[PDB]
């Protein structure tokens, strides 16, 4: 899996001129050192393994941070089960990583890391806590308690996690509907008409082809609330796997602000350098 | 037989250039028909050929010595040409590849330089605060197309807030820097070197075929990357033309006809 | 919440909105004001855990709002105030959670926690 | 402001929905659109905070949903204490919050 060996190039006196091109073309001219100055014989034994597709993407990489909270009702209120929607856009730097891409198709793999902590000096004691983390898929019911009867989970797929253990980890298949995932869109999902009632029958987002993409996560706390308030936080991490990739595209180079390509606030990315200074 | 000197035929219409580049062939794909290992819809499709893969020429642009830049978006620029645009229009789903030919032509005198670029899923950024706000009547433009703008003037109104574009012209309207954006299908216009631009795209999308109503697969950009001068004076200003022909167009799910509210 | 408890033209208005300790820090601070028949109007946010304030589109100019941690304490102030500015003026604590995480790091509050409020009319 | 209808009346024991329409980002993008109540003279008091669940102590009859850009408050089994004003909320794109115009509930 070697690179290409350097050959041996002595002096040159010729009518051939591979300096001189031309990139109005579209082409990039493809020279090699051997070309331009001599070169000796050189043996590679470089390779570009660590800058394949796969390779660029086998990192984890943090993209929910989910609160769920354990204690007894009192006057102030609660936060007794949280639901996050499942999307990598929030978390610049997965996106930033996926976003050199148009079109991409992989299997993927989840990985929960849960911490918890007390709140209250007064007490410090509370008991081991299993966590549920269900998967509703769109257009499935989701929760209006930490209790009622949509966390039976017979049909929807569930991670239970005790507290302490090795982190939990899933792997999901290619789920889209495409036949690869498109990080742009440009386009609508309706089209205003002529004959619509009102503006607001056609209207939609720019650049976004469908909301509720992926379907929401739900975590809470299988255990009775403990009289002391216990706060746990749900780190999930995103590792993309058989990652096959179409269209490159340039990075981002200014903030981003939002799930579209608006920017705003910087627009400023480059540095002061003078021209004839080193 | 030099490079230079390139004739382009389909249907009914032809191209010939004396001072071309060469001819870019996007990812080193030719446009072609939907195989029956890739067909997802089932019914029979239609295939005009002639009637639709013919070049159409758009609005010629004005180059002024202080212009930024414009932008189109494929297939909305073909929205009013005829019977592509009506069959279109009277399909729901449609496939169709393009040769894109841009004229831009000047004396030896001139100088200057344009970058034809060929961006796929050309998303473009917003005017004002509320994100991805832009109303379906500015992001589809047309054949009159786009304009780039040289810095962010934040549109602030209490009432309409005009839900436009605002594309910043060295962001590319989508917040990449200019210089990288050669990693796109593209050729340079160098007036010392070329008068015209051909490249030919193949149709890239997630599915085998879409709804060119609801979603625009290209778009194109031209921007000048030396800006153009002429002697001693600064009223300078040279047309700049843009003709775009349909290649392998195929038309699934026949129904009535969609009139869009622009 | 002690919301502080004012008549003139022209001239300019202060506010105050006292809550505990533990609010105070932990939760973020609204302003709402309310017109006789005009129904609810949104001012601003103000969150003393970090002091960033982030005022309406309709207000942006004329409100300016500053926190206080030793008598826990905000204030508002409109620097100029027109004759449509007569109306009742409501403190409210972002005290609610909701189940939807906001972006995916944060937590989204409603306000269930609401003041007294004061009257200001603007006229001669 | 987000639109209501001005006025809705019914008598007791009646089934009433009062109606929220927002736009696209809003009620329609966020699951953010809460409800208040407001007695003449008191202040708002939550009645729903997610869009279909209840705090705490809020009757039963109490019900809402979401269709798109419009979600509907539900008062089933209607009382005299129902009288008053229903304020709509709902989150706005770019982190603003907008009420909703108020809709006047008469117990005939």
């Known amino acids: 899996d070697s690179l290409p060996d350097t050959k041996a190039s002595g002096p040159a006196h010729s009518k051939e001129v591979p300096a001189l091109t031309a990139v109005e073309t579209g082409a990039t001219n493809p020279l090699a050192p051997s070309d331009t100055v001599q070169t000796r014989h050189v043996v590679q034994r470089r390779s570009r393994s660590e800058s394949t597709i796969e390779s660029f993407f086998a990192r984890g990489a943090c993209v929910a941070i989910i609160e769920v909270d354990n204690e007894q009702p009192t006057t102030r209120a609660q936060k007794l089960f949280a639901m996050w929607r499942i999307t990598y856009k929030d978390t610049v730097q997965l996106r930033r990583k996926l976003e050199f891409f148009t079109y991409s198709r992989f299997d993927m793999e989840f990985t929960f890391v849960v911490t918890a902590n007390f709140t209250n000096a007064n007490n410090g004691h509370a008991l081991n806590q299993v966590y549920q983390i269900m998967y509703i898929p769109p257009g499935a019911p989701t929760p209006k308690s930490w209790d009622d009867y949509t966390w039976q989970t017979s049909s929807n797929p569930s991670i239970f996690y005790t507290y302490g253990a090795a982190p939990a980890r899933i792997s999901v298949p290619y789920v889209g509907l495409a036949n690869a995932y498109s990080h742009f869109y440009d386009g609508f999902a309706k089209v205003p008409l002529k004959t619509d009632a009102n503006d607001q029958i056609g209207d939609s987002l720019y650049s976004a082809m469908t909301v509720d993409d992926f379907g929401v996560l739900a975590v809470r706390v299988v255990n009775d609330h403990n009289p002391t308030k216990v706060t746990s936080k749900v780190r999930i991490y995103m590792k993309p796997k058989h990652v096959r990739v179409w269209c490159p595209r340039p990075p981002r180079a200014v903030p981003y602000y939002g799930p579209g390509v608006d920017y705003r606030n910087n627009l400023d990315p480059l540095s002061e350098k003078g021209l004839t200074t080193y | 037989y030099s490079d230079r000197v390139l004739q382009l035929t389909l249907g009914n219409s032809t191209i010939t250039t004396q001072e071309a580049a060469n001819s870019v062939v996007a990812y080193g794909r030719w446009p072609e028909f939907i195989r029956d290992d890739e067909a997802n819809p089932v019914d029979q499709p239609t295939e005009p050929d002639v009637a639709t893969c013919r070049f159409y020429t758009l609005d010629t642009v004005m180059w002024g010595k202080e212009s930024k830049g414009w932008w189109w978006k494929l297939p909305d620029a073909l929205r009013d040409m005829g019977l592509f645009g009506q069959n279109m229009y009277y399909h729901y789903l449609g496939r169709s590849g393009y040769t894109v030919h841009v004229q831009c032509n000047a004396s030896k005198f001139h100088q200057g330089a344009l970058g034809v670029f060929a961006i796929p899923e050309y998303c473009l950024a917003g005017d004002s605060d509320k994100q991805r706000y832009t109303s379906y009547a500015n992001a589809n433009p047309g054949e009159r197309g786009g304009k780039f703008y040289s810095q962010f003037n934040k549109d602030n109104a209490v009432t309409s807030p005009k839900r436009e574009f605002c594309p910043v012209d060295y962001l590319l309207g989508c917040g990449v820097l200019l210089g990288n954006a050669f990693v796109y299908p593209h050729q340079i216009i160098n007036l010392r070197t070329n008068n015209s631009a051909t490249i030919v795209l193949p149709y890239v999308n997630a599915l085998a075929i879409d709804s060119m109503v609801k979603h625009n697969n290209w778009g194109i950009a031209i921007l000048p990357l030396s800006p153009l001068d002429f002697a001693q004076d600064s009223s300078v200003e040279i047309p700049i033309t843009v003709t775009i022909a349909p290649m392998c167009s195929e038309f699934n799910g026949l129904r009535n006809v969609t009139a869009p509210k622009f | 919440v002690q919301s502080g408890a004012l008549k003139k033209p022209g001239a300019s208005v202060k506010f105050s909105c006292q809550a505990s300790g533990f609010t105070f820090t932990t939760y973020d601070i609204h302003w709402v004001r309310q017109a006789p028949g005009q129904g609810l109007e949104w001012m601003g946010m103000?969150?003393?855990?970090?002091?960033?304030?982030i005022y309406a589109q309709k207000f942006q100019g004329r409100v300016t709002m500053t926190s206080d941690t030793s008598t826990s304490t905000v204030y508002m102030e409109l620097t100029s105030l027109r004759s449509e500015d007569t109306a009742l003026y409501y403190c409210?604590?972002?005290?609610?959670?909701?189940?939807?995480?906001?972006?995916?790091?944060?937590?989204?509050?409603?306000?269930?926690?609401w003041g007294t409020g004061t009257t200001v009319t603007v006229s001669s | 402001a987000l639109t209501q209808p001005a006025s809705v009346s019914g008598s007791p024991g009646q089934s009433i929905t009062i109606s929220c329409t927002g736009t696209?980002?809003?009620?329609?993008?966020?699951?953010?659109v809460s409800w208040y109540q407001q007695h003449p003279g008191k202040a708002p008091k939550l009645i729903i905070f997610?869009?279909?669940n209840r705090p705490s102590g809020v009757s039963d009859r109490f019900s809402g949903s979401k269709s798109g850009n419009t979600a509907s408050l539900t008062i089933s089994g209607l009382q005299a204490e129902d009288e008053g004003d229903y304020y709509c909320?709902?989150?706005?794109?770019?982190?603003?919050?907008?009420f909703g115009g108020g809709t006047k509930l008469t117990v005939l």
């Open positions: 409210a604590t972002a005290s609610r959670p909701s189940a939807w995480v906001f972006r995916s790091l944060y937590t989204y509050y409603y306000m269930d926690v």
């Open positions: 997610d869009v279909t």
């Open positions: 103000i969150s003393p855990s970090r002091d960033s304030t």
């Open positions: 696209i980002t809003d009620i329609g993008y966020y699951n953010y």
């Open positions: 909320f709902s989150h706005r794109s770019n982190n603003i919050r907008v």
